[PDB]
Design an enzyme around this catalytic site. Sequence first.
Site, short mmCIF file in Angstrom:
data_model
loop_
_atom_site.label_atom_id
_atom_site.label_comp_id
_atom_site.label_asym_id
_atom_site.label_seq_id
_atom_site.Cartn_x
_atom_site.Cartn_y
_atom_site.Cartn_z
N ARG A 300 0.88 -1.38 -0.14
CA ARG A 300 0.16 -0.09 0.09
C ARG A 300 0.81 1.30 -0.05
O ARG A 300 0.45 2.15 -0.92
CB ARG A 300 -0.96 0.10 1.16
CG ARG A 300 -2.15 0.90 0.73
CD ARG A 300 -2.78 1.36 2.10
NE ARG A 300 -3.29 -0.09 2.74
CZ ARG A 300 -4.40 -0.68 2.50
NH1 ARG A 300 -5.06 -0.10 1.60
NH2 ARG A 300 -4.75 -1.84 3.40
N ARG A 341 -13.50 -2.06 -2.83
CA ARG A 341 -12.85 -1.64 -1.81
C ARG A 341 -14.13 -0.86 -0.97
O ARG A 341 -14.34 -1.28 0.28
CB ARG A 341 -11.65 -1.00 -1.66
CG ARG A 341 -10.80 -1.46 -2.40
CD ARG A 341 -9.17 -1.46 -2.01
NE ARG A 341 -8.89 -1.79 -0.62
CZ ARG A 341 -8.64 -0.89 0.28
NH1 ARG A 341 -8.58 0.46 0.10
NH2 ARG A 341 -8.40 -1.45 1.56
N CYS A 372 -25.71 -2.60 -12.24
CA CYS A 372 -27.11 -2.70 -11.64
C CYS A 372 -27.19 -3.74 -10.31
O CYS A 372 -27.69 -4.86 -10.46
CB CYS A 372 -28.22 -3.44 -12.70
SG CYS A 372 -27.72 -4.84 -13.56
N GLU A 373 -26.84 -3.28 -9.24
CA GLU A 373 -26.95 -3.37 -8.18
C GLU A 373 -26.71 -2.18 -7.16
O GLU A 373 -25.88 -1.34 -7.69
CB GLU A 373 -26.26 -4.59 -7.39
CG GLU A 373 -24.81 -4.56 -7.65
CD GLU A 373 -24.05 -5.73 -6.99
OE1 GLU A 373 -23.52 -6.63 -7.69
OE2 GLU A 373 -23.93 -5.85 -5.60
N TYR A 402 -4.34 -2.29 -4.61
CA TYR A 402 -5.67 -3.29 -4.35
C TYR A 402 -6.75 -3.07 -5.52
O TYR A 402 -7.18 -3.98 -6.17
CB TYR A 402 -5.93 -3.37 -2.98
CG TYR A 402 -5.00 -3.93 -2.04
CD1 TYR A 402 -4.47 -5.19 -2.19
CD2 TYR A 402 -4.31 -2.92 -1.43
CE1 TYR A 402 -3.01 -5.54 -1.59
CE2 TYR A 402 -3.07 -3.14 -0.74
CZ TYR A 402 -2.57 -4.73 -0.78
OH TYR A 402 -1.42 -4.92 -0.05
C1 PLP Z 1 -1.05 -8.14 3.21
C2 PLP Z 1 0.60 -8.27 3.21
C3 PLP Z 1 1.85 -7.31 2.96
C4 PLP Z 1 1.37 -5.90 2.63
O1 PLP Z 1 0.27 -5.06 3.29
P1 PLP Z 1 0.12 -3.50 2.96
O2 PLP Z 1 -1.10 -2.77 3.79
O3 PLP Z 1 -0.18 -3.46 1.64
O4 PLP Z 1 1.62 -3.13 3.32
C5 PLP Z 1 2.91 -7.85 2.70
N1 PLP Z 1 3.44 -9.19 2.88
C6 PLP Z 1 2.52 -10.21 3.22
C7 PLP Z 1 3.05 -11.63 3.54
C8 PLP Z 1 1.18 -9.77 3.30
O5 PLP Z 1 0.09 -10.98 3.60
C1 PLP Z 2 -30.43 -7.82 -9.50
C2 PLP Z 2 -31.69 -7.42 -10.43
C3 PLP Z 2 -32.53 -8.58 -10.99
C4 PLP Z 2 -32.51 -9.90 -10.33
O1 PLP Z 2 -31.79 -10.58 -9.09
P1 PLP Z 2 -31.70 -12.11 -8.50
O2 PLP Z 2 -31.73 -11.84 -7.01
O3 PLP Z 2 -30.67 -12.54 -9.08
O4 PLP Z 2 -33.28 -12.76 -9.08
C5 PLP Z 2 -33.47 -8.22 -11.93
N1 PLP Z 2 -33.70 -7.17 -12.55
C6 PLP Z 2 -32.86 -5.86 -12.00
C7 PLP Z 2 -32.80 -4.67 -13.06
C8 PLP Z 2 -31.87 -6.16 -11.21
O5 PLP Z 2 -30.92 -5.13 -10.68
#
Ligand code: PLP
Ligand code: PLP
EC number: 4.1.1.20
Lengths: 443, 443
Positions: A300, A341, A372-373, A402
């Site tokens: 990071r 994230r 579309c969520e 990330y």
């Molecule tokens: C998650 C991780 C890092 C780095 O994490 P930062 O928040 O990006 O510094 C480094 N080494 C190992 C083994 C890890 O699992």
């Molecule tokens: C998410 C979504 C659906 C269907 O969701 P399921 O839980 O998989 O049935 C249908 N129409 C629209 C517009 C949506 O955003």
Amino acid sequence: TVENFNELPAHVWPRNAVRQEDGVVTVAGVPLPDLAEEYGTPLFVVDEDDFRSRCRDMATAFGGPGNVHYASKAFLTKTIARWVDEEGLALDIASINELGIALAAGFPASRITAHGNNKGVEFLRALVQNGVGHVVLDSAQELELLDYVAAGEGKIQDVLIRVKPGIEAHTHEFIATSHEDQKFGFSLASGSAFEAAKAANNAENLNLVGLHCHVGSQVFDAEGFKLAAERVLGLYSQIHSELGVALPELDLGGGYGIAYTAAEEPLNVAEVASDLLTAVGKMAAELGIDAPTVLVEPGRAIAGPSTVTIYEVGTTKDVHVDDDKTRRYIAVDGGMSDNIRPALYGSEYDARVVSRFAEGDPVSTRIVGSHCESGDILINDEIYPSDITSGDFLALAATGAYCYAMSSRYNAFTRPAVVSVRAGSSRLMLRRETLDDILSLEA
Amino acid sequence: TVENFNELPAHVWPRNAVRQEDGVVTVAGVPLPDLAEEYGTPLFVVDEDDFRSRCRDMATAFGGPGNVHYASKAFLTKTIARWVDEEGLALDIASINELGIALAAGFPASRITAHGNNKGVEFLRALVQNGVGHVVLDSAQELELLDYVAAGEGKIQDVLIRVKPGIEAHTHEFIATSHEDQKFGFSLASGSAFEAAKAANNAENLNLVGLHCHVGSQVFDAEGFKLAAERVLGLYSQIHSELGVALPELDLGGGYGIAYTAAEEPLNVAEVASDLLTAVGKMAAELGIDAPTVLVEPGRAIAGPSTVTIYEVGTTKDVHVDDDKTRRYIAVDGGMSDNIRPALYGSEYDARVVSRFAEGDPVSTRIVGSHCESGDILINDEIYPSDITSGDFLALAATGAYCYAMSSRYNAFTRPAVVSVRAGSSRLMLRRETLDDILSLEA
Ligand SMILES: *Cc1c(COP(=O)(O)O)cnc(C)c1O
Ligand SMILES: *Cc1c(COP(=O)(O)O)cnc(C)c1O
């Protein structure tokens, strides 16, 4: 207020970013609106000198480039591998394919440290065959299988052993337990770390060079790391006096923080490095052992601040939340496919219009993606100018870690392009995915 | 107990899955271990007749296959579009690339319904030029812009208008509010859905054919749907009596549930559809309007249960959680990159060894993936036999929806292969990615 939104917090944005007097933001002299129109949005834009300056800040602070490993989990390409190579840093890898990218870019295998909680036999062979610097052991099973694969080849393999000291370090606090209920390494407290060290000592095709731990996420001071280090150095002492072995290296992981928003303070490496090295030193002295070389593993804090993501604003609307209480929703043309994230961890990001100055009255705003969520939300709840509108370019800061690496093809969206900038020009690092890429998996 | 683990809950697993008497699980006659050994792990295996037979269950329940849209967002390839084509279903699409896939499968455009909360002008044009059956309008801006695009071309484009009735239907409850604070569509209660229907009618190049709403997730009865329908039909009545327009269609969205774990009841679509359509007829008649044709948009409930994900077990260890208490961690060769849903949403999955019967004492177990972060967790806390081990093939049920579509290349893991099975043979649908796929975006 309108004023604050038109500023650009230097401690969050990339080091070579500037708000010009017309409202346009430049990064290494290249106007962001010109990149958007040339390469399409959404766009990841990497400030190359910024990336390199964080390598050098890390290098100075931990006593040389080769004690700092870049954690490629954050973002890895051939280009990034070569930058890391040139600054003299080590590289953390965690899968056969990350190794693949590193070798393909010319990165010397002797400067590669290899992580993974479930390394297959193909992955191990490739590591030993290419003469990788360090393998970081996760389990008794990896330890035994690395020995066989090492014996099967010519070689002896330098290893570290991952240890759970019972410290989980966060921004404002650390949390201390006897044991860490998590999938990695060996407990310190059950003696299991000491029995792994014993087994790797005894193994004829493994050479034990030190212990590894990783205890941090978004950490801004050294106190959690000191307590992690004290505990782990108890084990360096037990190893010294029970087995007679001196261990030259101690690897303390990453988890070094960056400022995502204007209110957060930036990391100060040099202070954190000064406090932690010193403490290690005093602790090694107090125990009667050799102060090992400290290794670190920033992901990071090297890649993060160097990069922004530019979107184009599309739909805007005033959404009723009660009878005359509204919230402004701004749609941008990417979303959780290119930044998962905020949805996955609740992470807050700073957003700015980088095409102009806003003049609108500030109102409660939510930035949403194009999927579309509900939940496809980039910025949850902020007070931004109410003239942000269709055709503006809007960027989020600190998307270099990330984000790209966790990107998906949800709703068949194409992974964005990555462009890098330096000295007033732009180099394409990663082309934009195409519908043809998607469809080619069906042939 | 060990006996429960060795069963295969029929209501969760694909319809054509069977536990043979040696412990091996077959889907459509193909043993799952043979697929693993043939195409590598991790593997998505799709029971084609299962997928088809759910199309048929929906079609019979909602009065013919033309009333049922398959929600592509769950999972979409050219192969899936062809099956939906052959079964007679409509296809709801949410981006220009989901459209592209469908058209490249030769899926008839007049059976496509298009969604999106931020449809760009390119996308609108593709839709209007190909002659899609419906465009679901999400904002005042898309309406005016779709009118312009339609004028530019020959045409009058059929549209639905998305409405937010203040209902959020879940498994055990629904939540009713006057307004919905989310990105999609127009409020019922502000009057903005009325204004929008008023403007779509008016538009020369738009023909308004109904309203749309999506209220549900993981729904197993019609109570929430019914009240959503009551509120929306109140607007059908207001439209007829203030504009003199009668609307032939009503799209009630998806959100229909599937049983993920053994304790859950499967969906009874026959009973849920009967109760909803019956209530819609009763409400239409009480309001003195034509009873509209009801459309529905299942995704999960067509695609989810047809599919499993196979993994090879790697590393196993007992992890101390305090001094005297352990938890068994079983690692498998995929993770959050092929199934982000336990991490993102907290979703539970049912897991079974598909290569043999287990005999071991039952213990607290957690299943983890192969990525370098804690929280890469597939199954958080269940009690499974203690002989599950390296080389066993482990599968999660009900991964046909949202999983592959939300996969990522975190740690540079390649997207898994997708194989379909039918009548005792297997067909490759989507090839596994390779390193060369990842490297090609640099070239
Ligand atoms: C998650 C991780 C890092 C780095 O994490 P930062 O928040 O990006 O510094 C480094 N080494 C190992 C083994 C890890 O699992
Ligand atoms: C998410 C979504 C659906 C269907 O969701 P399921 O839980 O998989 O049935 C249908 N129409 C629209 C517009 C949506 O955003």
